[PDB]
């Protein structure tokens, strides 16, 4: 059955960007999807997106730019301490100048750079470049 809603969301983004289409439909829109797309949007990877609401769970329509290479989820959400942040960004990022690992901390969901600035850690959600 449908276990990780965020995984299916990011898979839909990946398939739509690989095919080259500039828009994509997402079902069914948890909160962490909204925060994930906000993080990808503030870094200039996707652009504007839309929250359709039916009365069940909601749908997202995302306008896609050409700026996305790959977005991905990490399952399960491993516990990440301070040293594991740069061990992870060594592990699964393309380079040391760009690319963002997304983790949810107790002060919200954020990328690894501003998590380093806030000096907080948490559980790893996914990555985007």
């Amino acid at each position: 059955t449908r276990s990780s809603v965020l995984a299916d969301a990011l898979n839909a983004i990946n398939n739509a960007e690989k095919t080259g289409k500039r828009q994509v439909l997402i079902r069914p829109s948890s909160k962490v999807i909204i925060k994930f797309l906000q993080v990808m949007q503030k870094h200039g990877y996707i652009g504007e997106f839309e929250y359709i609401d039916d009365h069940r769970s909601g749908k997202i329509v995302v306008q896609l730019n050409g700026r996305l290479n790959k977005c991905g989820v990490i399952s399960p959400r491993f516990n990440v301490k301070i040293g594991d942040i740069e061990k992870w960004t060594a592990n699964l990022l393309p380079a040391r100048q760009f690319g963002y690992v997304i983790l949810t901390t107790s002060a919200g969901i954020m990328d690894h750079e501003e998590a380093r600035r806030k000096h907080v850690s948490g559980k790893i959600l996914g990555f985007v470049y």
Partner: protein, 87 residues
């Protein structure tokens, strides 16, 4: 890209597709550069004055070059009622 203080590096900054906004590789031999001449008030085109649209090999190979060319032609105003946003 740049190093620390000036001295522009990165030889051959590559062109980017006007449809899917991906870069075009050096050996992408299916990529094309459509050159459209514009007209100035007499029905005749001026030699040397163009608008230019680069299409990558992937969108052209999928058959989606003509719909995308419709969209960028209608976006620039030289086309009137061929492409619809609402499909």
């Amino acid at each position: 890209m740049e190093n620390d203080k000036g001295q522009l590096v990165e030889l051959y900054v590559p062109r980017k597709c006007s449809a899917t906004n991906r870069i075009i590789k050096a050996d992408d031999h299916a990529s094309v550069q459509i050159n459209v001449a514009k007209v100035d008030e007499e029905g005749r085109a001026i030699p040397g004055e163009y608008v230019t649209y680069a299409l990558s090999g992937y969108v052209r190979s999928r058959g989606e070059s003509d719909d995308s060319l419709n969209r960028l032609a209608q976006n620039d105003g030289l086309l009137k009622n061929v492409w619809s946003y609402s499909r």
